[PDB]
Design a binder for this molecule. Structure first.
Ligand SMILES: C[C@H](N)C(=O)NS(=O)(=O)OC[C@H]1O[C@@H](n2cnc3c(N)ncnc32)[C@H](O)[C@@H]1O
Ligand SMILES: [Zn+2]
Ligand SMILES: [Zn+2]
Length: 738
């Protein structure tokens, strides 16, 4: 659908062709090349014959790339510090998949200023869409570093675009890594991801896709026909034009090494130790190389038949070959998965049964199972330390979160031991139920139930079911299909867009309890005003209540809500109010002064929690009433009664200390800079500016509720009780005041 001519192509005499195999547009400097350069159209042609002159380490290669764009003569890029793989700034993706995801949607919407323009970043990325490929294809990981130079072109203000991009890329490959310029190809394919799309180039070299360049000018939907489908979704054009690049670091370092897998090249410090521990034998070469070569020719969306095609090829039976490579697949996955695990846990992912947590856990189960398949009994946490020992030099937080990380593994590995036992029994029982029910195989669906609810991988369900004559049928793409199952998924509308924003008098003065305002509109029994001291529901804090005095009558405000920027007021007498009218409002103050205490107190508590429990602690939920308040956090073990006391004790020391509680609007990016992602506790607030409440040297938080000037005014905090809401979420209940 899109064009794809660049200056460079036109000037240096590239030819655009349609691949003989797949018919896709691609750009080659070589008039012979008939295929796109991408498997299965091409093979791996760099194993033992590296495609980059010298040998690079992960650390050299990263620093190379980073330096190149940072110091570039023509376009200098701003260097940006990598983001947590746990997307604290948004609510739509579970983990960080591409580097661009760091910048959706706020930066790409010009709602938030980019940290640089252009910018260069090395971004840890996690993709479970390829989890079944790890250890098989030799090129996929769960966790890899996407290196990227990004450029945000807001209207009437270019940085750079398509032409300059294919160049800075092509420069780096040839003038930095010294790649053979007529082995580079540029395949055309659009790229969609995390809310945006655009046409893109797949940079292909010697049989391995090493980079991807996206020219992003699209945003999703919403539910109205200047639309374009990019990958079976709907987009409309967008104001910004963004340069989305993605450079496979691992893939490049593999290239400068020619080892049999990218894993041997990047994850040596884990793979080779593990080979000794398994006592596995250094595989036959005429077997190893004639499998290493053909490995890139098969993905899964039927691995069986590749196995027969390398069997026939090399000269042996499938089992004979299975025997040979199988241990290597397992070692690679373990090495990989456990690195994914190190990055997630350090970024405060707490294993559980939902969202990111679910994933960490999945990863842990698959790992343990592989260790058991290799007949190894080294604890998982020991593998993980190898990753910490190695990476804590470049990633300082791995050493800082090291105890929480290791400990978290321990407990999950303990818990698995038992979950297996009772699960094995529970499944066998309800399989024996099915043999007689007349079922000889076990559907995929049921196999996914057995993981979802019992915690059993199907390498376990297949044996248990065969020691009773039902069949071992594991889909190749199982684990990725399981990873999909990690997420799920009103009062007044319409007549509101035309009305102005409601002035929020509670933000100017939280102690304001009386005010006057003009009745802007009276839909149903909801009254709209221009300005209001009534705090609408949201934040964990419930609505304010009180009276609106109108023509000398008191009318009760029973509910205050907020649609968009317009706050609605449920009254008892919709008749008594007319558009135009001037009303005197009075807040039910007691109810409010109580709420503020439970609010401020929640932040004081939040501070204490982090200080005892540690850094992984993040709001999972909040509810307060005038009486008690509750704060669900994300934690792994139970909060002991000795801790519960230390938390409460520290909290009360701060209420005693009477520290300043101060709030101020800040542009999103300055805010995230000054204070880090901690600000995004409960929720992720929209808009160009955010309200930052801070308690002096204690807590800081993008929060929109009404607070108190000073902690003294909270009064003592009695922690009533802690309790476990679900895996990874514990709950602290308490009540403040006199
Ligand atoms: C830039 C665009 N947003 C993007 O992320 N495209 S991409 O999906 O193709 O990723 C860019 C590069 O990251 C690397 N990459 C993608 N998936 C990978 C995986 N599973 N393992 C290792 N590297 C991967 C590849 O080198 C790829 O060329
Ligand atoms: Zn092709
Ligand atoms: Zn708050």
């Amino acid at each position: 659908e899109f064009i794809m001519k660049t200056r460079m192509f036109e000037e240096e005499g590239w030819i655009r062709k349609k691949c003989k195999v797949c018919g896709k547009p691609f750009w080659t400097l070589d008039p012979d090349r008939e295929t796109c350069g991408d498997p299965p159209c091409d093979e791996y042609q760099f194993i033992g014959k590296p495609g980059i002159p010298r040998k690079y380490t992960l650390d050299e290669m990263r620093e190379k790339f980073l330096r190149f764009f940072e110091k570039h003569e023509i376009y200098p890029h701003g260097r940006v510090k990598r983001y947590p793989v746990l997307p604290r700034w948004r609510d739509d993706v579970l983990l960080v998949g591409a580097s661009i995801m760091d910048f959706q949607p706020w930066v790409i919407s010009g709602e938030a200023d980019p940290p640089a323009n252009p910018l260069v970043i090395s971004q840890p990325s996690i993709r479970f869409t390829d989890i079944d490929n790890v250890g098989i294809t030799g090129r996929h990981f769960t966790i890899f570093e996407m290196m990227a130079h990004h450029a945000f072109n807001y209207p009437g203000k270019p940085i750079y675009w398509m032409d300059e991009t294919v160049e800075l890329a092509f420069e780096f490959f040839t003038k930095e890594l010294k790649m053979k310029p007529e082995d580079i190809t540029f395949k055309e394919n659009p790229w969609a991801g995390g809310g945006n799309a655009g046409p893109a180039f797949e940079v292909l070299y010697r049989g391995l896709e090493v980079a991807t360049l996206v020219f992003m000018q699209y945003k999703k939907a919403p539910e109205q026909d200047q639309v374009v489908v990019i990958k079976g979704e709907k987009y409309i054009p967008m104001e910004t034009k963004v340069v989305d690049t993605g450079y496979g670091l691992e893939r490049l370092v593999w290239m400068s090494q020619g080892t049999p897998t990218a894993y041997d090249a990047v994850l040596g410090y884990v793979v080779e130790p593990l080979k000794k521990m398994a006592g596995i034998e250094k595989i036959d070469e005429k077997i190893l190389m004639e499998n290493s070569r053909l490995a890139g020719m098969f993905d899964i969306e039927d691995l069986r038949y590749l196995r027969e095609q390398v069997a026939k090829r090399v000269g042996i039976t499938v089992e004979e070959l299975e025997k040979a490579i199988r241990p290597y697949e397992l070692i690679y996955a373990i090495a990989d998965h456990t690195k994914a695990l190190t990055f997630m846990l350090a970024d405060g992912v707490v294993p559980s049964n939902v969202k990111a947590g679910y994933l960490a856990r999945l990863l842990i189960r698959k790992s343990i199972r592989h260790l058991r398949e290799l007949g190894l009994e080294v604890p998982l946490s020991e593998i993980v330390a190898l990753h910490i020992k190695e990476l804590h030099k470049t990633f300082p937080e791995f050493k800082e979160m090291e105890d929480i990380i290791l400990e978290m593994i321990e407990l999950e590995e303990k818990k698995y031991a038992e979950t297996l036992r009772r699960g094995s029994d529970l499944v066998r029982r309800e399989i024996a139920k099915l043999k007689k029910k007349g079922i000889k195989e076990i559907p995929v669906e049921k196999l996914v139930t057995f993981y979802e609810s019992h915690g059993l991988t199907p390498e376990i369900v297949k044996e248990i079911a065969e020691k009773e004559g039902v069949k071992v049928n594991i889909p190749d793409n199982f684990y990725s299909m399981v990873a999909k199952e990690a997420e799920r998924t009103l009062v007044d509308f319409e007549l509101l867009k035309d009305l102005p924003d409601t002035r929020r008098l509670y933000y100017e003065d939280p102690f304001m309890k009386e005010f006057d305002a003009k009745v802007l509109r009276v839909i149903k029994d909801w009254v709209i005003l221009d300005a209001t001291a009534f705090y609408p529901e949201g934040g964990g804090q419930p609505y304010d209540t009180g009276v609106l005095i109108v023509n000398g009558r008191e009318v009760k405000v029973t509910n205050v809500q907020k649609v968009g920027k317009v706050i609605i007021h449920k009254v008892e007498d919709p008749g008594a109010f007319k558009e135009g009218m001037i009303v005197h409002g009075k807040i039910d103050w007691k109810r409010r002064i109580q709420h503020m205490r439970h609010h401020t107190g929640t932040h004081v508590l939040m501070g204490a929690l982090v200080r005892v429990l540690g850094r992984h602690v993040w709001q999972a939920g909040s509810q307060l009433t005038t009486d008690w308040a509750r704060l669900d956090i994300s934690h792994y073990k139970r909060i002991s009664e000795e801790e519960l006391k230390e938390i409460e004790m520290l909290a009360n020391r701060i209420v005693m200390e009477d520290r300043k509680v101060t709030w101020e609007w800040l542009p999103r990016t300055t805010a995230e800079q000054k204070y880090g992602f901690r600000l995004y506790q409960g929720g992720v607030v929209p808009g160009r500016e955010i309200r930052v409440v801070k308690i002096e040297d204690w807590d800081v938080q993008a929060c929109g509720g009404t607070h108190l000037p000073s902690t003294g005014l909270v009064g003592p905090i009695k922690i009533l009780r802690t309790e476990r809401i679900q895996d990874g979420v514990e709950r602290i209940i308490f009540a403040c005041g006199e």
